[PDB]
């Protein structure tokens, strides 16, 4: 009834669309720890016993999955872990030498993808130099009959450690305390713009870091309908992402079996190559169910008519570019496949199909990751036949007729993380209160309801990779003590509802009690009061020291 | 009423725990155990506890493992900036060494060709190696160039030990034990909390501990297992014996350049006539000490005739006495000392010949090694024999395990994690053995200690301590007892947990005894207090707005 007097609130659901550091949470079980992985450390903390999710009500937030923070953070972290895993492994320094190559002639027949190359190379004994003969792919070998390695222009080659594996391990990207990841329950949401009901998670489902071009593999499945994601309908340069309604089983193989030959370069260092191939040479086939593929592609066509109307649409093979862009490039079973995806999107097919669509593929030892210069890996030849069954669960297209597009490893991380957003809980709020001195459950709910449910938010707020985890920890400590000592300078440290001895001001706002505590939300409230937070803080701590010194003087007789 | 729940923050309680540990070198800059180690505090504080008994296992100590890892870290950080002599690996023609004054059996000059700092032409380099390092193929090669590679020591840095004072991070304490007669294993009768251990020299020795700690009263022997021959036996001698070692000749030093910015140090021709390198000990002192040792072995290990025999055999680092004299490693054949019935005249010193080795493959690791630089001129060393290492077979000397070297000095200390959170019924660490009613006076003193790449390691330990303090504060806030030692009333104590009577709890037992009595159930009461604070908080919320 009297004049409005201030009250501070610790733990009200509030956020700002912010940026922060996120720390990995690798899968808990031990066999994957044994199966050493480039993508996932063992130092990465185990996943939670219960991956937890809670759903909000009456809240709508804007998501921009094109400009979201998971994508940058995952790209940087995955490059860092790549470099870390490659660092101990040998640098194949004496590889970049002239080579005498001729096409490989197996005892059965000739191979199109291979040439036997003899060259001279200096070993751990510098005096000894002798001829060394090893196989090499045609794609990786650049001509000058004398060939050299393609990436001798870019960098000295680094061998992948056969100990470590390229297999995608689910990474639970998890945020420090004081930050909460916001998911969108709307299955049909295009990923851009508002989402009508959202969910708060302490951390995300396990995301597989999977390199793929022109298609998405082992990705998430749209539960209701096939979905299109578009940065800009008008602009052609932007990228179109198809999230597929249902999986399209892709079966890939290298039919032959490969023999690993080791050559010593250093003490405890060798270069691994493929020897002679056993068995009759046969091409690498990545075949897909044809009726399924046709029905799906046509469902893409039907769904896509709405977002670009009254125009004939034809999927066309990509015109040209580097092999990572034009051809579907991905790794399964520890080897790199590059598959001509022309036949899948070829307009030659007139809708008639009865048996598996076949795609020839080629395999490359030397790969430049993330399109960077300065780095180049040597894939050791996996021994035996590999046969990997994967799910086609998404496509990458671009308008000039829509063609497949590839090479943007950032977009693979975009396609999985379309729904998650970092938000920084700024737990401090200011408002008048009835009782006047002399996780995120109640976001959209009424203000008094949040005043009751403040305890849950407080409880959750209470509680370079090693350096990254340490950074997350100390950020939690610094934020916690920042808030606690600000409360101490406000007079109610350890109390969530800090009734204050300070009057409110008409200048800050003239809103009535019913308006703020019935209709306005904490985000709307922060919008109203966000311009005057500093001044209220300073004059509140002034009021505290004034009151305390007055009480000390009155205490003194 | 009956005794009901009460928290006690900062009371003396320890569980036998493992935590991280950091170096602290000497404060003086004369030695300026590299320099990145923090300087020690002026006063290593030590406080003896009354009525407290702790079971020290000399062989299941965590700090010996942490010491091994940390000193490996020191050594690898030292070696990493230094040069890697990978190009040294060439075929090597060799020939015996004939100085102008006499001939040497131990040596050979070898001639070999490399590349200059200018990247095309070099010239013949004739440098001198021992017979122990080189391996024939009459063309020779270094000992381990195929399986491993050799990392030259930085010529500036020296390998002599500096005393490291390991200190417990905040919330953790080191517990020395002050019983003088003690065999490492089992209870020790009275103990002392120490902020940091006494400065341990990272000394490398085999069969004869050097520059170590002295037995204060009598020669004391420790056992890892009486009934089994594998497990090792420690001897820690009272008084001492001077071991006096020399390098008789003058070896030149020749700096040969490998490439631009890389140079390694060989010897070149010797000056003076070659004399066998050797080390001697006083005969009478050795005989007295060894007779005492045999008598002690008779005393503890009963009824058996005990005899000392030389080491059986193996690589020269195994059978003999390895040690770093004057920044150079030698290996002294101990056929003189431990062999009985040689019938020494006892007036002359007992003399052991020694072989100096260039390439040191220590730390029980393959794939990494050192080319110790040849120090110029004579070297003299005069050190103690403060302990011996033997095994049951007869009793024979052994070596090669640096973990045992680190075991010998740290036999007194054990780490303990102070958990301030003491939960009891109710109506620096000196008062641990005292009563709880008396020990609650001094809980503030233990509370004080909770606050007070190796930079990153000690930062991680400090952050561990910080989040430990904040875990304590977080738990007390979840219980509502935060910021204070003793709380209010009205939370009952379930009888099933413990059965002692009201009066005898305080006076009779120690805090550790109560911890053992109450250890299992702690999680249950942490839940019941948690939910109690929640429901009381709900009631207090009903009180907050009236």
């Amino acid at each position, epitope marked *: 009834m009297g004049s409005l007097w201030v009250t501070v609130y610790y733990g009200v659901p509030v956020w700002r669309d912010a940026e922060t550091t996120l720390f990995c949470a690798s899968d808990a079980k031990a066999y994957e720890t*044994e199966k050493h992985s480039v993508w996932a450390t063992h130092a990465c903390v185990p996943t939670d016993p219960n991956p937890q999710e809670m759903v909000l009500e009456n809240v709508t937030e804007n998501f921009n999955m094109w400009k979201n923070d998971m994508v940058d953070q995952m790209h940087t972290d995955v490059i860092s872990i790549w470099d870390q895993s490659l660092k101990p492994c040998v640098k194949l320094t004496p590889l970049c030498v002239t080579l005498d190559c001729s096409t490989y002639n197996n005892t059965h027949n000739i191979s199109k993808e291979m040439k036997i190359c003899s060259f001279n190379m200096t070993t751990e004994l510098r005096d000894k130099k002798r001829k060394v003969n090893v196989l090499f792919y045609k794609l990786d070998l650049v001509p000058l009959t004398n060939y050299r390695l393609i990436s001798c222009n870019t960098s000295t080659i680094t061998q992948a450690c056969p100990k470590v594996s390229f297999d995608p391990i689910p990474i639970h990207y998890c945020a420090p305390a004081g930050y909460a990841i916001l998911k969108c329950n709307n299955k049909t949401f295009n990923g851009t713009g508002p989402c009508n009901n959202v969910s708060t998670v302490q951390c995300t489902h396990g995301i597989k870091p999977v390199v793929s071009t022109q298609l998405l593999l082992n990705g998430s499945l749209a539960e209701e309908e096939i979905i299109i994601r578009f940065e800009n309908l008008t602009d052609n340069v932007k990228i179109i992402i198809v999230q597929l309604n249902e999986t399209i089983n892709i079966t890939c193989t290298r039919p032959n079996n490969y023999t690993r030959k080791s050559i010593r370069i250093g003490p*405890g260092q060798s270069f691994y190559a493929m020897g002679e191939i056993v068995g009759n040479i046969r091409e690498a086939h990545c075949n897909i169910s044809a009726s399924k593929w046709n029905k799906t592609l046509e469902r893409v066509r039907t769904k896509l008519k709405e977002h670009f109307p009254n125009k004939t649409i034809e999927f066309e093979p990509s015109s040209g570019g580097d092999l990572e862009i034009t051809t579907h490039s991905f790794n399964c079973g520890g080897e790199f496949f590059y598959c001509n995806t022309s036949g899948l999107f070829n307009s030659a097919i007139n809708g008639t199909l009865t048996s598996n669509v076949t795609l020839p593929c080629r395999i490359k030892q030397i790969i430049n990751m993330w399109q960077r210069v300065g780095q180049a890996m040597y894939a050791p030849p996996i021994a035996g036949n590999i046969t990997c069954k994967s799910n086609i669960t998404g496509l990458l297209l671009t308008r000039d007729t829509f063609r497949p597009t590839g090479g943007d490893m950032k977009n693979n991380w975009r396609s999985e993380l379309y729904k998650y957003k970092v938000v920084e809980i700024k737990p401090l709020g200011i408002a008048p209160t009835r009782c006047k001195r002399r996780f995120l459950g109640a976001a959209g709910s009424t203000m008094g309801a949040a005043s009751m449910t403040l305890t849950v938010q407080a409880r959750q707020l209470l509680s370079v990779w090693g350096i990254k985890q340490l950074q997350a920890r100390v950020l939690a400590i610094e934020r916690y003590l920042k808030d606690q000592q600000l409360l101490g300078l406000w007079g109610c440290s350890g109390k969530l509802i800090c009734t204050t001895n300070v009057p409110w001001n008409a200048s800050w706002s003239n809103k009535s009690k019913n308006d703020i505590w019935d209709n306005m939300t904490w985000m709307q409230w922060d919008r109203e009061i966000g311009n005057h937070t500093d001044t209220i803080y300073r004059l509140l701590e002034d009021s505290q020291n004034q009151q305390e010194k007055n009480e000390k003087d009155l205490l003194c007789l | 009423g009956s005794l009901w729940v009460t928290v006690y923050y900062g009371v003396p309680v320890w569980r036998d725990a493992e935590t991280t540990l950091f170096c602290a070198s000497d404060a003086k800059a004369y030695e300026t155990a590299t320099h990145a180690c923090v300087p020690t505090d002026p006063n290593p504080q030590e406080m003896v506890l009354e009525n407290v008994t702790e079971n020290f296992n000399m062989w299941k100590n965590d700090m010996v493992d942490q010491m091994h890892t940390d000193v490996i870290s020191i050594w690898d950080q030292s070696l990493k900036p230094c040069v890697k002599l990978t190009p040294l690996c060439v075929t090597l023609d060799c020939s015996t060494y004939n100085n102008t004054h006499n001939i040497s059996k131990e040596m050979k000059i070898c001639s070999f060709n490399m590349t200059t700092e200018l990247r095309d032409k070099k010239r013949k380099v004739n440098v001198l190696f021992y017979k122990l390092d080189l391996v024939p193929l009459t063309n020779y090669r270094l000992i381990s160039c195929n399986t491993s590679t050799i990392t030259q020591a930085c010529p500036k840095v020296s390998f002599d030990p500096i005393p490291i004072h390991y200190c417990a991070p905040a919330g953790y304490a080191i517990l020395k034990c002050n019983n003088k007669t003690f065999n490492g294993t089992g209870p020790c009768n009275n103990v002392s909390t120490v902020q940091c251990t006494h400065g341990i020299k990272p000394v490398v020795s085999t069969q004869l501990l050097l520059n170590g700690s002295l037995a204060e009263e009598e020669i004391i022997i420790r056992f890892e297992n009486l009934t*089994d021959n594998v497990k090792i036996i420690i001897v820690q001698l009272n008084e001492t014996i001077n071991i006096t070692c020399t390098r008789p000749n003058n070896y030149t030093r020749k700096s040969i350049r490998i490439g631009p910015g890389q140079s390694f140090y060989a010897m070149g021709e010797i000056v003076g006539n070659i004399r066998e390198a050797h080390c001697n000990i006083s005969a009478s002192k050795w005989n007295k000490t060894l007779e005492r040792v045999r008598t002690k072995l008779k005393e503890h290990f009963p009824n058996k005739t005990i005899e000392f025999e030389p080491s059986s055999g193996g690589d020269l680092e195994i059978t003999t006495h390895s040690f770093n004299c004057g920044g150079e490693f030698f290996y002294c054949n101990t056929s003189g000392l431990f062999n009985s019935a040689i019938n020494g005249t006892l007036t002359s010193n007992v003399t052991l010949p020694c072989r100096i080795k260039q390439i040191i493959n220590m730390w*029980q690791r393959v794939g990494q090694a050192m080319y110790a630089p040849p120090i110029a001129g004579n070297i003299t060393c005069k050190s103690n024999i403060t302990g011996l290492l033997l095994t049951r077979d007869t009793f024979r000397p052994t070596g090669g395990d640096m973990k*045992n070297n680190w075991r010998s000095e740290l036999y007194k200390y054990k780490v303990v994690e102070i958990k301030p959170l003491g939960i009891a019924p109710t109506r620096f660490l000196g008062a641990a053995g005292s009563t709880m009613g008396a020990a609650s006076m001094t809980l503030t003193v233990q509370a004080r200690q909770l606050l007070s790449v190796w930079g990153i390691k000690q930062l991680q330990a400090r952050v561990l301590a910080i989040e430990r303090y904040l875990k304590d504060q977080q738990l007390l806030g979840l219980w509502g007892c935060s910021g204070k030692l003793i709380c209010t009333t009205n939370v009952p104590w379930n009888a099933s947990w413990s059965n002692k009577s009201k009066n005898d709890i305080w006076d009779n037992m120690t805090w550790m005894q109560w911890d053992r009595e109450i250890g299992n159930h702690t999680d249950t009461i942490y839940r019941l207090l948690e939910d109690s604070q929640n429901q009381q908080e709900k009631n207090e919320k009903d009180l907050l707005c009236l």
Partner: antibody
Amino acid sequence: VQLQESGPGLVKPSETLSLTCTVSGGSIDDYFWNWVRQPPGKPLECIGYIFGRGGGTKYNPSLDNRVTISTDTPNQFSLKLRSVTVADTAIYYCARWNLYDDDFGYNSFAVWGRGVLVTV
Amino acid sequence: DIQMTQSPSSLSASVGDTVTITCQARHAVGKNLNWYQQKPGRGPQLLIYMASSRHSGVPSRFRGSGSGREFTLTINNLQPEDFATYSCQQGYTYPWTFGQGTKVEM
């Protein structure tokens, strides 16, 4: 890679012994090639080990002045022993020490052959 | 040459065994131990390569651990294929000796 032994079913005492091990899967690598004899209910024992194709060889002084390792063809590597004795009767095997750090299995007999029993 | 021992010399149980080993000679060889499994009348194959972690192919049931003279191998949740011999091995010097052979049955 698959490894297999080859030799005589029976030897007589005081007669020379020979054995040949075959790496079927691929050519003879640069890894360490080993013979690991298993005596009847007693610990296994090394004989002569060669670092690849025509590399240096380390033999055992426990079986002094009898062992020899030599290679003939890129898929065969052989052991030869002279002046055998009755105590040598055992099951022989061939195996491979992984000298290099990053390969799965390091300084370890990774792939062994099935082995052959010699009576002597 | 190094002498080698194992304990128990021949165990007999199904699930949860533990093969401790004392290998004597110069103790604390490092992490330079290699376990093996030899099926009856068959070639042995690798289990643990540094007393550290499992080899490729051998499951997580088989593990090796310990530094110092007290190297150890633990097998958990044994299946019928698990029952076979296991031996100590060194890595320092050229003659790598083996343990007498710890046997597990039933």
